[PDB]
């Protein structure tokens, strides 16, 4: 039972974490995940900062998809103050949020395919960041979410590049879909892990790909009527093969479902930039409001107890992947050191929203 | 031509590996000493084939055979030592 | 006990200075002017050529003169 140190510079690059295991032989049997490495103290500083000052702070959580964090932390005060967002800016927010979900799943499967290369996905990623530069102007550090919608307007080149992104992107996606059917090393090196079912993934804490891996059509934005999700084409992954390749088909189907949503929303266009802007500064109320949104990892959440002041009295975040990190102590029991790379890939986690 | 000195080196190995085979704490040091003894006899056969028997390489053929049996002896002796290492706690 | 050649000088030294002087600037020039205009068959054979033709490039490695003018500019330094 030689204790692994599981150091800060991992052989893989998926964050800094601590997974000391007794490993009797090569079989890992007992996990003790030590965290606190990439920690900032978001809650106390968010109690010490306003919404327009913790609004630059929402970038250090799920920075592979930064639209979700600022999206839920601006959708908090919109439903809190009951201020209506017009349909145009809300649908463009839906388009860019699904594009960030696309970016999150491809930036998962990039380094996951690198561990188990970079320019096989970067040919797409250069045009993806060109879309981010034509949408807001930054690469992943955007500050463009207001109460009335997008802080700016879409330029006349970004809608043309958004029309071109579908037949720029879906063809290389379906050229990348056949690899797992062709290449048997993904049928023999990541096949098998992920043995949890649906009645158990509901039982512990799970959401996102680990909950849709068992063949459950789970969606917050389908159950909760949000952003007119029943107008668009939906196909939530009811893939019941359980394992890690079931999760890969889950993520391919989620990317293709977002492609279908954006492709139906290419020519929608139902309406200004910011509705209800009389003054630059405002405040918040005091309610008992827990707002959540469909994360790419499953139910990102914002807890809020107001102060009727410039600062929020309570600001607690429920990150999706940190609740999804609880299941590995149970998914460690009968695997190998060559398996834990596939495990910490298939969790689909970065340490930005973990410690926070 | 000092070339008969390699026989003296052979006898040096044949005495030192035998001394290490008598006084040995564990088993694997004595097994390595046994292998040095097989080396002493082995280089003796190679030297005698070099000196006398070069049409037939009978000493060198026996060198191949004695290094084969040295390999088999070392393999089974380490198998015994490893089975002891399994059977202790 | 053959000595089939019986040449004292200027047999392989001429070929050595030929291969070490005439070849490497034309080889490096073909590496420059065909950096993008290539099939992967052409990049394959150019990689095989630059692998075969390595140690002549030692006198041409630090020196670099006709390399950078993608305009019609003036030396305004």
């Amino acid at each position: 039972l030689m204790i692994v140190n599981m150091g800060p510079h991992h052989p893989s690059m998926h964050g800094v974490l601590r997974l000391i295991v007794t490993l009797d032989g090569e079989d890992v049997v007992d996990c003790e995940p030590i965290l606190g490495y990439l920690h900032r103290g978001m809650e106390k500083i968010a109690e010490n900062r306003a919404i327009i000052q913790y609004l630059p702070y929402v970038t250090r959580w799920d920075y592979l998809a930064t639209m979700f964090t600022e999206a839920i932390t601006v959708n908090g005060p919109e439903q809190l103050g009951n201020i209506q967002v017009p349909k145009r800016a809300s649908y463009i927010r839906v388009i860019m949020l699904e594009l960030s979900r696309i970016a999150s799943h491809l930036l998962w499967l990039g380094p996951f395919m690198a561990d188990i290369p970079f320019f096989y996905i970067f040919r797409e990623r250069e045009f993806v960041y060109d879309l981010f530069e034509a949408a807001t102007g930054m690469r992943m550090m955007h500050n463009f979410f207001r109460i009335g919608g997008i802080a700016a307007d879409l330029p006349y080149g970004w809608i043309d590049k958004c029309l071109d992104f579908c037949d720029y992107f879906l063809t290389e996606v379906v050229e990348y879909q056949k690899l797992i059917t062709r290449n048997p090393i993904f049928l023999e090196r990541v096949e098998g892990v992920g043995i949890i079912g649906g009645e158990e993934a509901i039982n512990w804490g799970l959401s996102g790909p680990m909950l849709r891996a068992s063949g459950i059509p789970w969606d917050l934005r389908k159950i909760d009527r949000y952003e007119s999700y029943d107008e668009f084409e939906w196909e939530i992954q009811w893939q019941k093969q359980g394992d890690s390749l079931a999760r890969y088909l889950v993520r391919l189907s989620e990317m293709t479902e977002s492609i279908k949503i954006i492709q139906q929303a290419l020519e929608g266009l139902p309406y200004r930039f910011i509705s209800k802007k009389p003054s630059p500064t405002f405040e918040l109320s005091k309610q008992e409001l827990y707002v959540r949104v469909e994360a790419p990892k499953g139910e990102l959440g914002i807890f809020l107890i107001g102060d009727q002041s410039g600062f929020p009295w309570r600001w607690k975040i429920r990150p999706p992947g940190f609740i999804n990190l609880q299941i590995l102590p149970e998914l460690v029991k009968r695997m190998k050191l060559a398996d834990i790379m596939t495990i910490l890939g298939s969790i689909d986690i970065i340490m930005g929203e973990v410690d926070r | 031509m000092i070339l008969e000195h390699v026989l003296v080196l052979s006898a040096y190995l044949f005495l030192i590996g035998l001394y290490g085979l008598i006084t040995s704490r564990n088993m694997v040091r004595a097994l390595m000493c046994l292998e040095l003894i097989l080396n002493a006899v082995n280089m003796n056969f190679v030297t005698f084939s070099d000196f006398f028997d070069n049409s037939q390489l009978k000493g060198e053929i026996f060198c191949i055979f004695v290094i084969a049996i040295a390999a088999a002896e070392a393999a089974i002796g380490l198998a015994i030592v490893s089975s002891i290492y399994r059977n202790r706690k | 006990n053959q000595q089939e050649l019986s040449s004292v000088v200027l047999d392989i030294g001429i070929i050595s200075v030929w291969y070490f002087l005439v070849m490497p600037p034309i080889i490096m020039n073909w590496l420059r002017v065909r950096w993008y205009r290539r099939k992967f068959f052409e990049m394959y054979l150019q990689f095989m050529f630059v692998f075969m033709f390595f140690p002549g490039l030692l006198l041409w490695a630090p020196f670099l003169n006709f390399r950078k003018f993608p305009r019609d500019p003036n030396m305004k330094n």
Partner: protein, 167 residues
């Protein structure tokens, strides 16, 4: 208020020795090869630009360093002790970054932890900023003539036992 150096002479004043020093310094300024050290928001520049933690002396700290990160970081600098230095490529390796006031478990720069040559603007710049940073560092090492191999150990210690109370 500073100290005084020795500054006697330059003993290696031949043409061959200064030629070898210039060539070894320019080749030392040519071969960066970082051990990457990402695992933060500055890891994103690695895909656009080893594993033995005693090998690559020319590492740049491209990560958000905290107080719990600090013992492993100074141990890793102990694993790169004599030859080369580090480059701060984050506002949090310089001033603590955006949390420079009120963060308890984040050090206000590694400028109180490790010798730093070059300070960056910080939050992920363009991928040619790291190229300009290693070019500057190459100009810095080109100024260095390997200090004419001039060496001093302090060795401050008490052999009196502390008033200990372990668990």
């Amino acid at each position: 208020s500073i100290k005084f150096p020795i500054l006697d002479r330059t003993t290696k004043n031949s043409v061959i020795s200064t030629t070898l020093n210039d060539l070894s310094n320019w080749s030392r300024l040519s071969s960066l090869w970082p051990l990457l050290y990402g695992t933060s928001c500055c890891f994103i520049e690695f895909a656009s630009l080893r594993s033995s933690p005693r090998q690559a002396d020319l590492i740049l700290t491209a990560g958000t360093v905290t107080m719990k990160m600090a013992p492993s970081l100074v141990r890793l600098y102990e694993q790169m002790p004599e030859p080369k230095y580090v480059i701060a490529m984050g506002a949090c390796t310089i001033t603590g970054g955006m949390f420079s006031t009120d963060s308890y478990s984040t050090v206000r720069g590694v400028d109180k932890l490790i010798p730093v040559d070059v300070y960056l603007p910080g939050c992920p710049p363009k991928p040619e900023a790291v190229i300009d940073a290693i070019t500057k560092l190459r100009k810095k090492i080109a100024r260095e003539i390997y200090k004419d191999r001039i060496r001093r150990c302090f060795t401050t210690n008490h052999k009196f036992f502390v008033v200990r109370s372990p668990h």
